[PDB]
């Protein structure tokens, strides 16, 4: 397999509005990000997946873009963007921009022209109809919004302020490629593609994800822009299966580097039910089966996996599948070890490296995400009390991943000097913060740092196969094998002691959050024990 710079890379996702505020408006900005590049360099990440910082009304906080080639006032300006690029590069960190082209803001110049002048070319940049079908919006309601100005419905799988682009229009696709090349020319390291598996949509036929022309568009996009370069492109694909992922990531297809698959995240809610009907108790056996399948199916020179626990749209891993009490740190380390030692490119969400958690939202007013507010509005009139609604939101609400990054124990956790922050800082910041984590030699931060270094200095993390071992339900163990080197990863994913009925000859310990020797010798695992040892 041809190796690229990103094959040894670990990506760090930054949610711009909640990373670092440098001008006291209570909202993170580009200068704030740039001011923390030394930190990220210490962590050792090679790239930053930067969520949207483009001009936007912020109806969906950046994913509703009004201008693909201008920075939103709140984040700063193009000069700030350029400096981030240059300062990051100087520290060996590439910037991966968030590519949101399945839709734009209804305040984008193209849509304004499409609505005001139905005969214009840009009218066809969007999807209109006289007779709407039953397609629904992901944020609630019909996916069709009637426009009384032109007397037609426009499609929007997301919010009403995010009209869908018409990917059947070759001229629209071209303008998207011109825009992508605008960014490529500035020296970015790649693109994270927002719900990219939706561009093959055919609404008339109720075809949304995995449309028939989907891969053809990606091949066309590749050839017209990033293909000739050596960038990292990761597509967000909810409708992806291992076979489809191969189509995406096998380099011979000339499409993407990898994609984000959400099969494991699916274990967070009852099957066939909205994410709001969550499941607290992680089904470890199911997880083993899912991870094992993706590690097995996407073999070398056949596909490449992306590895992640959470992002800006998901609950922080500790709150959903980890321990937020007595074993916060240990569980956090255990989950990090379990994921990063598999084959693929791991993604760390800001704050994950210090073990931040979800926020205890008390009422609707304290929220910001349109998705949560829409769900609440609808649930309230359908048999759900406000408390029940707030309980679901405290667990699954997207705002849980958007509270300010916790840097220290000062005001606003060192995130801002403002009276208040756009989203409230978690009270646990007094205990959970970057300064304290950097001070404690055995904090969660260093575990991530060590995992990152191992991946940067060892070919086996890339070349070794994956084999799931037969163990107790809550024990997640597997080996990575290449030639004659054998690495055993054992992670006790539970708050209880578990049995480890195995016998091996330990050669060396690569990383451990406990006494690996005692666990091996006693054939028992203390809660959240996690380690990787090279064995004979």
Ligand X SMILES: OC[C@H]1O[C@H](OC[C@H]2O[C@H](OC[C@H]3O[C@H](O)[C@H](O)[C@@H](O)[C@@H]3O)[C@H](O)[C@@H](O)[C@@H]2O)[C@H](O)[C@@H](O)[C@@H]1O
Residues engaged in binding ligand X (CB under 6 A)? 60, 63, 100, 138, 158, 194-195, 236, 238, 275, 312-313, 371, 398
- Which of ligand X, Ca ion, none has residue 21 at its interface (CB below 5 to 8 Å by kind)? Ca ion
Q: Is the CB of 42 or the CB of 420 nearer to Ca ion?
A: 420
**Nearer to ligand X by C-beta: 15 or 304?**
15
Residue 194 vs 329, nearer CB to ligand X: 194
Helix axes 242-249, 284-297, angle to 10 degrees: 40
List the one residue out of 186, 284, 273 whose CA is nearest residue 492.
284
DSSP for 404-452 reads: PP---SSGGGGS--SSS-SSPPPGGGGTS-HHHHHHSTTSHHHHHHHHH
- The nearest distance, CB 370 to ligand X, in angstroms, is 8
**Residue 25 lies near Ca ion (rule: CB under 5 A):** yes
The site map against Ca ion for 380-419 (x = CB under 5 A) is -------------------------------------x--
| Distance separating alpha carbons of residues 99 and 50, to the nearest angstrom | 10
Residue 532 near residue 510, CB atoms below 8 Å: yes
Q: CA 165 to CA 380: how far, in whole Å? A: 32
Binding status of residue 231 toward Ca ion by CB under 5 A: no
23 binds Ca ion (CB under 5 A): yes
Rule CB under 5 A: which of 410-469 touch Ca ion?
Answer: 417
Q: How far is the CB of 22 from Ca ion (least distance, A)?
A: 6
Partner touching 194 among ligand X, Ca ion, none, CB below 5 to 8 Å by kind: ligand X
The residues facing 481 across adjacent strands are 465, 486
**Nearest residue by C-beta to ligand X?**
238
21 binds Ca ion (CB under 5 A): yes
Among ligand X, Ca ion, none, partner that 148 touches (CB below 5 to 8 angstroms by kind): Ca ion
Query: What own/partner pairs with CB < 8 Å and gap ≥ 24 does 494-499 have?
Result: 494/284, 494/527, 494/528, 495/323, 495/327, 495/527, 495/528, 496/527, 497/524, 497/525, 497/526, 497/527, 498/472, 498/474, 498/524, 498/525, 499/472, 499/475, 499/523, 499/524, 499/525
CB nearer ligand X, residue 160 or residue 398: 398
The strand pairing partners of 532, in sequence order, are 489, 511
Q: Quick one: 312 or 474, whose CB is closer to ligand X?
A: 312
User: According to the binding rule CB under 5 A, does residue 116 interact with Ca ion?
Assistant: no
- Of these partners, Ca ion, ligand X, none, which one is at the site of residue 197 (CB under 5 to 8 Å by kind)? none
Q: How far is the CB of 418 from Ca ion (least distance, A)?
A: 6
Q: How far is the CB of 308 from Ca ion (least distance, A)?
A: 27
504 forms beta bridges with none
Of positions 11, 14, 20, 27, contacts Ca ion by CB under 5 A: 27
Return the one option of ligand X, Ca ion, none that residue 185 interacts with (CB less than 5 to 8 A, by type): none
Which residue number, 15 or 476, has a Cβ lying nearer to ligand X?
A: 15
Report how far residue 187's alpha carbon sits from residue 289's, in angstroms, rounded to the nearest whole number.
40
Give the nearer residue to ligand X in terms of CB position, either 158 or 407: 158
CB of 51 to ligand X, least distance (A): 7
Query: In the complex, what is the shortest distance from the CB of residue 398 to ligand X, in angstroms, rounded to a whole number?
Result: 6
Q: Which residue has the tokens 């590895």?
A: 307
Q: To the nearest whole angstrom, how small is the minimum distance from the Cβ of residue 312 to ligand X?
A: 6
Question: Which residue in 162, 114, 118, 170 sits closest to 141, CA to CA?
Answer: 162
Candidates 26-34, 317-325, 349-357, 382-390; binding stretch for Ca ion (CB under 5 A): 26-34
Scan for tokens 């199916």, then name that residue. 297
Q: What is the dihedral of CA 526, 529, 533, 536, to 10 degrees?
A: 30
Which residue lies nearer to ligand X by CB, 93 or 100?
100
CA pair distance 128, 144, nearest whole angstrom: 9
x-or-dash string of contact with Ca ion, 126-165, rule CB under 5 A: ----------------------x--x--------------
What is d(CA 241, CA 263) in angstroms, rounded to the nearest whole number?
Answer: 8
Query: Whole-angstrom Cα distance, residue 534 to residue 532?
Result: 7
Least CB distance to ligand X at residue 139 (A): 7
* Shortest Å distance, C-beta 13 to ligand X: 10
The helix (run of H) or strand (run of E) holding residue 332 is helix 328-340
Burial class (CB within 10 angstroms; exposed 0-12, middle 13-18, buried 19+) of 271: exposed
Strands 232-236 and 258-260, how do they pair? parallel
The distance of closest approach from Cβ of residue 482 to Ca ion in the complex, given in angstroms and rounded to an integer, is 47
3 vs 455: CA distance, rounded Å: 13
Binding-site partner at residue 330 among ligand X, Ca ion, none, CB < 5 to 8 Å by type = none
CB of 381 to ligand X, least distance (A): 21
Size, binding site for Ca ion by CB under 5 A: 8
Q: Which does 371 bind (CB under 5 to 8 A by kind): ligand X, Ca ion, none?
A: ligand X
Q: Taking the chain, what is the end-to-end CA distance rounded to the nearest angstrom? A: 27
Binding site partner of 313, from Ca ion, ligand X, none, Cβ cut-off 5-8 A by kind = ligand X
CA dist., res. 353 & res. 12, Å (int): 10
In the bound state with ligand X, the residue whose beta carbon lies nearer, of 314 and 437, is 314
Least distance (Å) from ligand X to the CB of residue 481? Answer: 35
Which of positions 66-85 make contact with Ca ion (CB under 5 A)? none
Interacting residues with Ca ion (CB under 5 A)? 21, 23, 25, 27, 29, 148, 151, 417
């Amino acid at each position: 397999m041809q190796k690229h710079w990103w094959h040894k890379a670990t990506v760090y996702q930054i949610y711009p509005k909640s990373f670092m505020d440098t001008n006291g408006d209570g909202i993170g900005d580009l200068k704030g990000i740039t001011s923390k590049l030394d930190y990220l360099q210490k962590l050792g990440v090679m790239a930053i997946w930067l969520s949207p910082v483009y001009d936007s009304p912020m109806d969906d906080n950046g994913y509703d873009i009004a201008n693909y080639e201008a920075i939103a006032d709140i984040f700063g300006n193009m000069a700030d963007m350029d400096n981030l690029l240059t300062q990051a590069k100087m520290r060996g960190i590439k910037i991966i921009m968030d590519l949101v082209v399945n839709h734009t803001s209804d305040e984008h110049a193209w849509f304004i022209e499409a609505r005001e002048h139905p005969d214009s070319s840009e009218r066809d940049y969007y999807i209109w109809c006289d007779q709407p079908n039953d397609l629904e919006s992901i944020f609630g309601g019909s996916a069709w919004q009637y426009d009384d100005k032109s007397d037609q419905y426009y499609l929007h799988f997301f919010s009403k302020k995010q009209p869908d682009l018409n990917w059947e229009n070759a001229n629209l696709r071209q303008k998207i490629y011109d825009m992508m090349n605008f960014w490529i020319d500035k020296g970015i390291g790649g693109f994270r593609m927002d719900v990219i598996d939706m561009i093959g949509k055919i609404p008339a036929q109720h075809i949304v994800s995995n449309g028939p022309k989907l891969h053809a568009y990606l091949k066309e996009m590749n050839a017209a822009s990033f293909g000739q370069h050596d960038l990292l492109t990761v597509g967000q694909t909810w409708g992806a299966t291992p076979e489809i992922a191969k189509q995406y990531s096998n380099p011979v297809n000339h499409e993407l580097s990898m994609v984000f698959q959400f099969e494991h995240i699916g274990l967070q809610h009852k099957p066939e039910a909205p994410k709001w009907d969550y499941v607290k108790e992680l089904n470890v056996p199911a997880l083993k089966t899912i991870f094992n399948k993706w590690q097995t199916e996407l073999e070398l020179g056949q596909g490449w996996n992306s590895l992640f626990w959470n992002n800006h749209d998901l609950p922080r891993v500790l709150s959903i599948w980890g321990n937020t009490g007595k074993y916060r740190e240990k569980s956090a380390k255990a989950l990090a070890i379990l994921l990063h030692l598999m084959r693929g490119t791991p993604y760390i969400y800001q704050g994950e490296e210090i073990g931040m958690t979800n926020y205890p939202f008390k009422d609707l007013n304290e929220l910001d995400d349109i998705e949560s507010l829409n769900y609440a509005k609808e649930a309230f009139t359908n048999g759900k009390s406000m408390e029940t609604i707030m309980d679901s939101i405290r667990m699954i609400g997207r705002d849980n991943a958007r509270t300010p990054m916790q840097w220290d124990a000062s005001q606003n956790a060192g995130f801002s000097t403002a009276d208040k922050t756009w989203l409230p800082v978690n009270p646990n910041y007094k205990d959970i913060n970057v300064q304290a984590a950097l001070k404690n030699s055995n904090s969660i931060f260093y575990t991530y740092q060590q995992l990152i270094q191992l991946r940067k200095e060892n070919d086996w993390l890339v070349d070794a196969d994956f084999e799931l071992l037969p163990t107790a339900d809550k024990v997640f163990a597997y080996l990575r094998k290449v030639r004659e080197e054998r690495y055993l990863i054992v992670v006790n994913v539970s708050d209880q002691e578990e049995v480890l009925e195995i016998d091996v000859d330990k050669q060396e310990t690569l990383i451990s959050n406990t006494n690996e020797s005692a666990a091996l010798a006693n054939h028992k695992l203390q809660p959240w024990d996690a380690f990787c040892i090279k064995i004979l």
